[PDB]
Amino acid sequence: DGVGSSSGNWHCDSQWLGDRVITTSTRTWALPTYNNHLYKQISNSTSGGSSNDNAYFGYSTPWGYFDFNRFHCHFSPRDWQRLINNNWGFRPKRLNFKLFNIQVKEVTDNNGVKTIANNLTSTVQVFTDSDYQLPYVLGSAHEGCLPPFPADVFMIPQYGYLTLNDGSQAVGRSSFYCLEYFPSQMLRTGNNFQFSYEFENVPFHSSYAHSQSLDRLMNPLIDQYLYYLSKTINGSGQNQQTLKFSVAGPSNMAVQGRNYIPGPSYRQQRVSTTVTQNNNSEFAWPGASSWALNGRNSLMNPGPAMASHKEGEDRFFPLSGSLIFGKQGTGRDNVDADKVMITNEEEIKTTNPVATESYGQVATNHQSDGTLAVPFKAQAQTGWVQNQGILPGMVWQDRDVYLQGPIWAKIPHTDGNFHPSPLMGGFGMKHPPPQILIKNTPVPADPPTAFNKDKLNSFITQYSTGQVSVEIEWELQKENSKRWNPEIQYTSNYYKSNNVEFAVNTEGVYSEPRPIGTRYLTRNL
Amino acid sequence: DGVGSSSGNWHCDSQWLGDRVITTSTRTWALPTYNNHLYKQISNSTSGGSSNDNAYFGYSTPWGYFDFNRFHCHFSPRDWQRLINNNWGFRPKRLNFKLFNIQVKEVTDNNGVKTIANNLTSTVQVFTDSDYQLPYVLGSAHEGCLPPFPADVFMIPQYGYLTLNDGSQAVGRSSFYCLEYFPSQMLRTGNNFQFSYEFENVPFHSSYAHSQSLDRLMNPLIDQYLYYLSKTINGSGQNQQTLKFSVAGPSNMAVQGRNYIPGPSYRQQRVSTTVTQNNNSEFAWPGASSWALNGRNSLMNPGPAMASHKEGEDRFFPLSGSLIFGKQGTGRDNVDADKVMITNEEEIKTTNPVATESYGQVATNHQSDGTLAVPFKAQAQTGWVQNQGILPGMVWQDRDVYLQGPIWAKIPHTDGNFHPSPLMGGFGMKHPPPQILIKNTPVPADPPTAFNKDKLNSFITQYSTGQVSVEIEWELQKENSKRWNPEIQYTSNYYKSNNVEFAVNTEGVYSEPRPIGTRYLTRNL
Amino acid sequence: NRPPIAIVSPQFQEISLPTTSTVIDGSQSTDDDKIVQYHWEELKGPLREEKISEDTAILKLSKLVPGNYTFSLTVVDSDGATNSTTANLTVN
Amino acid sequence: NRPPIAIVSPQFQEISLPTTSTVIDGSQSTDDDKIVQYHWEELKGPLREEKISEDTAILKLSKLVPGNYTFSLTVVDSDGATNSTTANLTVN
């Protein structure tokens, strides 16, 4: 309150009470005036056209929204090391969003000379969509989230939603949410904003890789008293059918009776990082899994949590089945393979079928050798199962969350769903933390002396600045495994190199070299 | 609080309660924006290369840190006179650091015209490293400390640490401390900062020269009933061995039995101020004591507290064994001998071996004149002891602190150490007063209308100003010697001269002519 | 990838015996990375019962006969780039 | 360092067409370590528009013409030791 008094102190510490990790964070935000304070609608008809698949119809609201659903907004890589190394899961528990220390600045352009003097009177609006009655757009890893390195000052991304679209034309159901129609809160350089949010009961995330393959869950020393069919012909010859069973023991663990079967599968195309082995044709789009509701295709990216590759095939990775984050300084499009870092998932090859493999096989006809009056001599033929739905007793493991990976994602308000764990990884919440849309109010320049009924399109250019602080207390589940072989941990290699990992370059650009998973500890099935 | 209200009054007095000397001090600070608000790393690879010895790898943090570990920040030379003349020691007891009256100013450069208008909204961060979890860089007499003359307005030095470096390349252990990752405090032109710090129990400093040579500690009137070996041959001839003892009295005080022996020694090279006597070769680097851990040399500067020269040899001084402060107006490098003032240490020649001398001699073989079946006729040969480690009952005196000399220095957090008195002089504290790192927050100029995910490298140039006040209460140990000969004191010579000592020149530059020790009073061993 | 800068000091020296012992510093070897080794080789000298071969940064000389000397300091960095600078020593 | 044991089953088979499709299991390849690959090559066969080259453990055959067949299973372990056992297939 008042110009000469800071409205809130810069908290950025990361306390570790024990079974609670309060991870405050603060970055400086700069927010321009988007769309000249208008609500221009967007369609591919305006963006120059697009394919049938890429058609969209939505509105370009002038509000900027603070997004912080990426793990590296809060966790310094050292904290992320302390949380993956020794912990068996975590989940957010609360939130606290202090928006303080606004200063609105007026930009004047005379003869191409930029003079920036602040407005001690202009106001910037803030409000939280606390009933989710707006189209939730947090939850696709949209690149506008808070700066990985605290000092980094970031530009607040623009808020624009999409609605129904028959081609590029709206339909009757196409909704148009006017943001100002919501009760805002006006801050005018001496005020601060704060809402506390309580995370709902979201299940503990799996921060552990399984040290017991789901198909080697048995005892390797005792038979299993469940005989399996072993032979069907006594020997090579004519008319020598028989039916010989045998016990399923440790000598033959393939045919062993099992209580549980690996999780779902939706086969992905296989592409190998060694560019020589891939076929010499453009199979980027044609030949990748897609689900295609309403007649328009869309890549099954990243799809159901599936292991990237079979043990020993490191070079491979599914076409559209892994998050592929871009390293700092990479181009927007058509970058080479080495400038983008790929998240491999070998960590759940135990209880998930391999993404590029075909989940077993199912017999397709009857092995009735000699039939009565309709003889076919049909041998038992087997067909593969490229895609398999969830059956009785099937277990699986959800996808991993990386340091550069999303936290939450609103569960679409639908009449039903199954295991709402957002496929990109994270937590599925019916009531995620709300959006915080911020807009700096228009202030018309100089209306005419004579009346005029138009919308007064001449506003004076201005922007804002301040700080934003997101304290989000996690809850841990400490590990108490009686394992004797030393655990596997995440470390930074001790070897001389030009730059320290996760540390600034000579120019000052903060570089994250590799994605950090959260499955390092081991817990038996 | 508020723009039109000073946030703290200028205290600069120096109270003398009696056995307590509260020495407040205040100077005006100006702090630019270092490194354009980045964390550029520094190495000799970037600074143009260096020798094997000078390689380093560290980060150039944009924070400025207030440093006040020099005695003349607090003590006006008159107070320093009142504290060396009649006092037998002192030690800091408390601290009080009020940072008040910030004003942030914005610099605009249009057509090369500097227009400076203040920002009533921009904020400057302050925080104290109150757990020493940052690399302590106070404690090498780094020239950025508070202005000797109160009026002097000073620029806050930049904070940049060093870590491990295999050559100029970091290793795995090389740590990267991000300063913003600490809970700051934001002051925005109407706030003030204040922390009180309690000095730990640091031993009283020795503000006295010993008036009894350690080798003349006896009684010159009585023999000592401990016979010493005096003669070994009766007279010049063949085969005239004998063994004659005699009493060690006052007639021969060299061989007198003694309880205690002088302190350690690490011989330094001898260089004479009369430039004619020094040898005609460049022995600056080659031929000076160095300790050289990890394969890289480094001068033993200033090394273990050792007396500079034997009584009467004033012109000499050890090569690398004395603090050599530069007088105001001196060049950065390659200055002549008269423009730098050398601190001689003749004040502890009593209980410390001379720096340029070789601490006695130790016999190296057995004086067995005629041996049985292995005759050698080996005379008792003696070898010198250039460097001697601490033995049982050895006493010594730590180095002096000068007016232009450091106060404290963090004791490195190691598993063990011996007599942690920083060799440059001062007090060794396991928990010294913390650093106070101050940074003025970035405020991005004008981000684009379209979104862009970069670090927003365009900030508006600005700096800060205010005052800083350091009240640091010392504790004295008054002197009660029954000496009858008048004590020796520190005085300013009564003789007409162009300028008063410790007083400003015609141009206004404050000139300190000579270093002032703190060992003037005399206390018997 | 800057090559090392070999700076031997002092470059020129005049010494008259019963103090033949002279040292010329070679530790002033500028480079980005660590100087892996120093190599000293004397190109010209009056015939002596010994020949100067050493790897120390600070070259130690003893028993110098009258004549003219030209020593060569060769430095190698981590990468392998070598820069050789010569030193001239003269004894009266 | 035991070499792999290649056991192809069934060894001998008598099949009469409209069921030419026959599979001979080769997955019974005993070794200490993983069998890195399986190689199938048919040494003798009646002239056919196609030649049997595959890497699958369970060899799939289709469109078999009358005659005598002799298939050869070659297995390789991690170390590289190879053991080749032949299979004889006969069609009436």
mmCIF file of N, CA and C in Angstrom, chain A residues 184-256:
data_model
loop_
_atom_site.group_PDB
_atom_site.id
_atom_site.type_symbol
_atom_site.label_atom_id
_atom_site.label_comp_id
_atom_site.label_asym_id
_atom_site.label_seq_id
_atom_site.Cartn_x
_atom_site.Cartn_y
_atom_site.Cartn_z
ATOM 1 N N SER A 184 -13.101 -9.310 -11.452
ATOM 2 C CA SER A 184 -11.659 -9.177 -11.399
ATOM 3 C C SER A 184 -11.232 -8.602 -10.056
ATOM 4 N N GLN A 185 -9.961 -8.239 -9.963
ATOM 5 C CA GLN A 185 -9.433 -7.460 -8.853
ATOM 6 C C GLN A 185 -8.397 -6.509 -9.416
ATOM 7 N N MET A 186 -8.494 -5.235 -9.066
ATOM 8 C CA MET A 186 -7.696 -4.200 -9.704
ATOM 9 C C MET A 186 -6.550 -3.787 -8.795
ATOM 10 N N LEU A 187 -5.324 -3.968 -9.275
ATOM 11 C CA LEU A 187 -4.110 -3.604 -8.558
ATOM 12 C C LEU A 187 -3.464 -2.438 -9.286
ATOM 13 N N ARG A 188 -3.051 -1.410 -8.547
ATOM 14 C CA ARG A 188 -2.611 -0.158 -9.162
ATOM 15 C C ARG A 188 -1.309 0.338 -8.530
ATOM 16 N N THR A 189 -0.294 -0.525 -8.537
ATOM 17 C CA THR A 189 1.144 -0.351 -8.232
ATOM 18 C C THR A 189 1.444 -0.336 -6.745
ATOM 19 N N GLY A 190 0.453 -0.483 -5.883
ATOM 20 C CA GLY A 190 0.724 -0.542 -4.467
ATOM 21 C C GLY A 190 0.009 -1.692 -3.803
ATOM 22 N N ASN A 191 -0.660 -2.520 -4.592
ATOM 23 C CA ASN A 191 -1.432 -3.629 -4.065
ATOM 24 C C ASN A 191 -0.796 -4.955 -4.445
ATOM 25 N N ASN A 192 -1.228 -6.003 -3.755
ATOM 26 C CA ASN A 192 -0.759 -7.352 -3.997
ATOM 27 C C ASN A 192 -1.942 -8.302 -4.003
ATOM 28 N N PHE A 193 -1.768 -9.416 -4.695
ATOM 29 C CA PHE A 193 -2.811 -10.407 -4.887
ATOM 30 C C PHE A 193 -2.369 -11.713 -4.251
ATOM 31 N N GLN A 194 -3.323 -12.483 -3.739
ATOM 32 C CA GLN A 194 -2.967 -13.728 -3.061
ATOM 33 C C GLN A 194 -4.174 -14.642 -2.988
ATOM 34 N N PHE A 195 -4.055 -15.859 -3.512
ATOM 35 C CA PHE A 195 -5.057 -16.869 -3.231
ATOM 36 C C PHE A 195 -4.357 -18.128 -2.765
ATOM 37 N N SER A 196 -4.960 -18.801 -1.798
ATOM 38 C CA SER A 196 -4.480 -20.082 -1.316
ATOM 39 C C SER A 196 -5.377 -21.164 -1.884
ATOM 40 N N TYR A 197 -4.774 -22.221 -2.405
ATOM 41 C CA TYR A 197 -5.511 -23.297 -3.041
ATOM 42 C C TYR A 197 -5.140 -24.622 -2.404
ATOM 43 N N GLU A 198 -6.150 -25.449 -2.096
ATOM 44 C CA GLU A 198 -5.908 -26.774 -1.463
ATOM 45 C C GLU A 198 -6.027 -27.884 -2.514
ATOM 46 N N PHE A 199 -4.924 -28.598 -2.774
ATOM 47 C CA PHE A 199 -4.911 -29.695 -3.729
ATOM 48 C C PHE A 199 -5.786 -30.830 -3.238
ATOM 49 N N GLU A 200 -6.556 -31.408 -4.148
ATOM 50 C CA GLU A 200 -7.413 -32.512 -3.760
ATOM 51 C C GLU A 200 -6.585 -33.780 -3.569
ATOM 52 N N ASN A 201 -7.251 -34.841 -3.130
ATOM 53 C CA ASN A 201 -6.564 -36.081 -2.793
ATOM 54 C C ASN A 201 -6.156 -36.791 -4.073
ATOM 55 N N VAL A 202 -4.980 -36.448 -4.581
ATOM 56 C CA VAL A 202 -4.430 -37.032 -5.800
ATOM 57 C C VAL A 202 -3.450 -38.133 -5.403
ATOM 58 N N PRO A 203 -3.468 -39.297 -6.050
ATOM 59 C CA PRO A 203 -2.656 -40.416 -5.562
ATOM 60 C C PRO A 203 -1.168 -40.136 -5.669
ATOM 61 N N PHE A 204 -0.403 -40.765 -4.775
ATOM 62 C CA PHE A 204 1.046 -40.612 -4.771
ATOM 63 C C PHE A 204 1.622 -40.997 -6.120
ATOM 64 N N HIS A 205 2.506 -40.161 -6.645
ATOM 65 C CA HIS A 205 3.149 -40.495 -7.902
ATOM 66 C C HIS A 205 4.186 -41.586 -7.684
ATOM 67 N N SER A 206 4.407 -42.404 -8.705
ATOM 68 C CA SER A 206 5.322 -43.537 -8.604
ATOM 69 C C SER A 206 6.728 -43.065 -8.935
ATOM 70 N N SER A 207 7.496 -42.748 -7.902
ATOM 71 C CA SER A 207 8.902 -42.376 -8.060
ATOM 72 C C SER A 207 9.835 -43.555 -7.836
ATOM 73 N N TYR A 208 9.611 -44.676 -8.514
ATOM 74 C CA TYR A 208 10.432 -45.856 -8.291
ATOM 75 C C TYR A 208 10.296 -46.796 -9.473
ATOM 76 N N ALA A 209 11.399 -47.421 -9.840
ATOM 77 C CA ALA A 209 11.379 -48.444 -10.870
ATOM 78 C C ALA A 209 11.333 -49.812 -10.215
ATOM 79 N N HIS A 210 10.610 -50.725 -10.840
ATOM 80 C CA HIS A 210 10.333 -52.020 -10.241
ATOM 81 C C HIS A 210 11.525 -52.936 -10.453
ATOM 82 N N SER A 211 12.003 -53.542 -9.371
ATOM 83 C CA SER A 211 13.127 -54.458 -9.431
ATOM 84 C C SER A 211 12.689 -55.904 -9.496
ATOM 85 N N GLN A 212 11.577 -56.191 -10.163
ATOM 86 C CA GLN A 212 11.121 -57.563 -10.341
ATOM 87 C C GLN A 212 10.226 -57.610 -11.564
ATOM 88 N N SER A 213 10.732 -58.173 -12.651
ATOM 89 C CA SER A 213 9.971 -58.215 -13.886
ATOM 90 C C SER A 213 8.656 -58.949 -13.666
ATOM 91 N N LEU A 214 7.574 -58.385 -14.206
ATOM 92 C CA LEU A 214 6.245 -58.947 -13.982
ATOM 93 C C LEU A 214 6.117 -60.377 -14.477
ATOM 94 N N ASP A 215 6.957 -60.793 -15.410
ATOM 95 C CA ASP A 215 6.947 -62.163 -15.888
ATOM 96 C C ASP A 215 7.991 -63.040 -15.213
ATOM 97 N N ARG A 216 8.688 -62.526 -14.203
ATOM 98 C CA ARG A 216 9.595 -63.291 -13.352
ATOM 99 C C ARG A 216 9.251 -63.066 -11.894
ATOM 100 N N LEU A 217 7.969 -63.152 -11.575
ATOM 101 C CA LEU A 217 7.473 -62.891 -10.235
ATOM 102 C C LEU A 217 7.447 -64.135 -9.355
ATOM 103 N N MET A 218 7.812 -65.294 -9.888
ATOM 104 C CA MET A 218 7.599 -66.560 -9.215
ATOM 105 C C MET A 218 8.792 -66.926 -8.339
ATOM 106 N N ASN A 219 8.830 -68.191 -7.922
ATOM 107 C CA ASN A 219 9.898 -68.757 -7.114
ATOM 108 C C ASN A 219 10.725 -69.685 -7.983
ATOM 109 N N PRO A 220 12.017 -69.477 -8.146
ATOM 110 C CA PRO A 220 12.758 -70.273 -9.126
ATOM 111 C C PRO A 220 13.207 -71.629 -8.617
ATOM 112 N N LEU A 221 12.639 -72.111 -7.515
ATOM 113 C CA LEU A 221 13.100 -73.357 -6.919
ATOM 114 C C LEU A 221 12.033 -74.427 -6.764
ATOM 115 N N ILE A 222 10.763 -74.115 -6.989
ATOM 116 C CA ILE A 222 9.686 -75.053 -6.714
ATOM 117 C C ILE A 222 8.760 -75.115 -7.920
ATOM 118 N N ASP A 223 8.305 -76.321 -8.247
ATOM 119 C CA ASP A 223 7.332 -76.505 -9.312
ATOM 120 C C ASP A 223 6.011 -75.849 -8.917
ATOM 121 N N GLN A 224 5.011 -75.906 -9.794
ATOM 122 C CA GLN A 224 3.818 -75.102 -9.560
ATOM 123 C C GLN A 224 2.517 -75.900 -9.584
ATOM 124 N N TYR A 225 2.562 -77.227 -9.544
ATOM 125 C CA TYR A 225 1.363 -78.069 -9.425
ATOM 126 C C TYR A 225 0.231 -77.650 -10.364
ATOM 127 N N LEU A 226 0.524 -76.969 -11.467
ATOM 128 C CA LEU A 226 -0.475 -76.672 -12.487
ATOM 129 C C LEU A 226 0.077 -77.129 -13.822
ATOM 130 N N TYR A 227 -0.330 -78.312 -14.253
ATOM 131 C CA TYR A 227 0.217 -78.907 -15.457
ATOM 132 C C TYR A 227 -0.182 -78.100 -16.683
ATOM 133 N N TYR A 228 0.757 -77.943 -17.610
ATOM 134 C CA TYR A 228 0.526 -77.244 -18.862
ATOM 135 C C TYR A 228 0.682 -78.216 -20.018
ATOM 136 N N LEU A 229 -0.034 -77.958 -21.107
ATOM 137 C CA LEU A 229 0.042 -78.832 -22.272
ATOM 138 C C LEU A 229 1.391 -78.631 -22.945
ATOM 139 N N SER A 230 2.171 -79.702 -23.078
ATOM 140 C CA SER A 230 3.532 -79.588 -23.583
ATOM 141 C C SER A 230 3.703 -80.175 -24.976
ATOM 142 N N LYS A 231 3.282 -81.416 -25.184
ATOM 143 C CA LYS A 231 3.394 -82.066 -26.480
ATOM 144 C C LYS A 231 2.008 -82.310 -27.049
ATOM 145 N N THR A 232 1.933 -82.446 -28.369
ATOM 146 C CA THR A 232 0.654 -82.711 -29.009
ATOM 147 C C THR A 232 0.799 -83.816 -30.048
ATOM 148 N N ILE A 233 2.018 -84.051 -30.517
ATOM 149 C CA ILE A 233 2.307 -85.172 -31.397
ATOM 150 C C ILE A 233 3.397 -86.017 -30.755
ATOM 151 N N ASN A 234 3.202 -87.337 -30.765
ATOM 152 C CA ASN A 234 4.213 -88.227 -30.206
ATOM 153 C C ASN A 234 5.517 -88.137 -30.984
ATOM 154 N N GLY A 235 5.436 -88.153 -32.307
ATOM 155 C CA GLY A 235 6.622 -88.088 -33.138
ATOM 156 C C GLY A 235 6.228 -87.854 -34.577
ATOM 157 N N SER A 236 7.231 -87.526 -35.383
ATOM 158 C CA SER A 236 7.006 -87.175 -36.780
ATOM 159 C C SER A 236 6.409 -88.365 -37.518
ATOM 160 N N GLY A 237 5.205 -88.195 -38.045
ATOM 161 C CA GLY A 237 4.578 -89.267 -38.786
ATOM 162 C C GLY A 237 3.156 -88.915 -39.159
ATOM 163 N N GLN A 238 2.456 -89.912 -39.684
ATOM 164 C CA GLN A 238 1.064 -89.781 -40.082
ATOM 165 C C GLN A 238 0.172 -90.310 -38.969
ATOM 166 N N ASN A 239 -0.844 -89.531 -38.605
ATOM 167 C CA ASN A 239 -1.856 -89.950 -37.640
ATOM 168 C C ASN A 239 -1.216 -90.350 -36.310
ATOM 169 N N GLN A 240 -0.579 -89.376 -35.671
ATOM 170 C CA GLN A 240 0.076 -89.597 -34.391
ATOM 171 C C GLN A 240 -0.279 -88.498 -33.408
ATOM 172 N N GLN A 241 -1.560 -88.153 -33.327
ATOM 173 C CA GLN A 241 -1.999 -87.173 -32.349
ATOM 174 C C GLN A 241 -1.928 -87.752 -30.945
ATOM 175 N N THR A 242 -1.629 -86.887 -29.983
ATOM 176 C CA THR A 242 -1.623 -87.259 -28.578
ATOM 177 C C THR A 242 -1.798 -85.997 -27.752
ATOM 178 N N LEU A 243 -1.794 -86.158 -26.434
ATOM 179 C CA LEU A 243 -2.038 -85.015 -25.560
ATOM 180 C C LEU A 243 -1.273 -85.270 -24.262
ATOM 181 N N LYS A 244 -0.053 -84.751 -24.191
ATOM 182 C CA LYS A 244 0.829 -84.976 -23.058
ATOM 183 C C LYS A 244 1.008 -83.680 -22.288
ATOM 184 N N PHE A 245 0.663 -83.700 -21.010
ATOM 185 C CA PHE A 245 0.881 -82.572 -20.121
ATOM 186 C C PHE A 245 2.206 -82.735 -19.390
ATOM 187 N N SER A 246 2.620 -81.675 -18.704
ATOM 188 C CA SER A 246 3.786 -81.740 -17.838
ATOM 189 C C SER A 246 3.712 -80.588 -16.852
ATOM 190 N N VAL A 247 4.486 -80.686 -15.783
ATOM 191 C CA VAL A 247 4.428 -79.682 -14.725
ATOM 192 C C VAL A 247 5.189 -78.442 -15.160
ATOM 193 N N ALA A 248 4.707 -77.281 -14.739
ATOM 194 C CA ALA A 248 5.334 -76.013 -15.083
ATOM 195 C C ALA A 248 6.187 -75.558 -13.913
ATOM 196 N N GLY A 249 7.498 -75.721 -14.029
ATOM 197 C CA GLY A 249 8.376 -75.512 -12.903
ATOM 198 C C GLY A 249 9.294 -74.330 -13.095
ATOM 199 N N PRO A 250 10.547 -74.458 -12.651
ATOM 200 C CA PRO A 250 11.540 -73.428 -12.963
ATOM 201 C C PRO A 250 12.286 -73.686 -14.255
ATOM 202 N N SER A 251 12.335 -74.932 -14.724
ATOM 203 C CA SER A 251 13.040 -75.221 -15.966
ATOM 204 C C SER A 251 12.373 -74.553 -17.156
ATOM 205 N N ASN A 252 11.069 -74.294 -17.069
ATOM 206 C CA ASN A 252 10.312 -73.652 -18.146
ATOM 207 C C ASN A 252 9.391 -72.618 -17.507
ATOM 208 N N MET A 253 9.890 -71.394 -17.362
ATOM 209 C CA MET A 253 9.119 -70.332 -16.735
ATOM 210 C C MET A 253 8.188 -69.620 -17.698
ATOM 211 N N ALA A 254 8.287 -69.893 -18.996
ATOM 212 C CA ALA A 254 7.396 -69.237 -19.940
ATOM 213 C C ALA A 254 5.953 -69.659 -19.716
ATOM 214 N N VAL A 255 5.708 -70.952 -19.552
ATOM 215 C CA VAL A 255 4.357 -71.483 -19.496
ATOM 216 C C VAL A 255 3.816 -71.494 -18.068
ATOM 217 N N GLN A 256 4.498 -70.830 -17.149
ATOM 218 C CA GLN A 256 4.108 -70.834 -15.750
ATOM 219 C C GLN A 256 2.793 -70.086 -15.580
#
